[PDB]
Amino acid sequence: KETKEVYEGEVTELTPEDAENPLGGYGKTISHVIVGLKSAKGTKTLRLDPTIYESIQREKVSIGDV
């Protein structure tokens, strides 16, 4: 027996939140990725570690559908 914690819903917009690079650099350095949430009987909005950039590399569903 075990338990897992999962966040799920519908994403209004899938776009990482850019921020200044802590090291002397250029371009865009993501500090957080805002993920929209939408579910029946409960709906919020949250942000995540920009490491999911590789996770969002291949989903092939829609623009934040489920």
Binding site: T12, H32, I34, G36, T45, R47
Partner: peptide
């Protein structure tokens, strides 16, 4: 050393309002 925590929390708090689909 501690001010960045408050800065991040408050900026996330203020960005959570307009991003919320309330209208």
């Amino acid at each position: 050393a501690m001010e960045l925590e408050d800065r991040k929390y408050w900026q996330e708090q203020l960005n959570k309002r307009d991003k919320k689909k309330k209208k």
